Amino acid sequence: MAVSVTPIRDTKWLTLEVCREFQRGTCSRPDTECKFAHPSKSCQVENGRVIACFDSLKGRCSRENCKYLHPPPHLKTQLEINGRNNLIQQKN
Template sequence: MAAVVHVNSLLNGKDSRWLQLEVCREFQRNKCSRQDTECKFAHPPANVEVQNGKVTACYDSIKLNTEKNQII
């Protein structure tokens, strides 16, 4: 039954877990030496809520950044 609920939520587009990014642990300790663009983990600004070590990305932001980075 749980699998059916999961599939239904994916099909309905309401499952936002794929938008969750793990926050850099070193960044949280102010010790990450990488730039935001070089680190594979999120470096969220102070006004972004972190829950269980993750942040939820804005779909429109990802879409916009993807479109900007497309090779024409």
């Protein structure tokens, strides 16, 4: 479906890294101010990274156990600019 029914074939700009100090509960900033992402409980992680909620960014999310990182003000600036670096080109 990646090239015929669903164009959301990847998350290259949304797959934000996790905070290293938060992995041992020794970080010094909240999720709203840190340099990396801070998963809650239901948030799914892969290879030391977490996917930001595309549904929350596009205006579709309504979950209570969302597996994706709702983007904080300190990282929305990074996600905007990461998205702008790829949204400028498409073929399918």
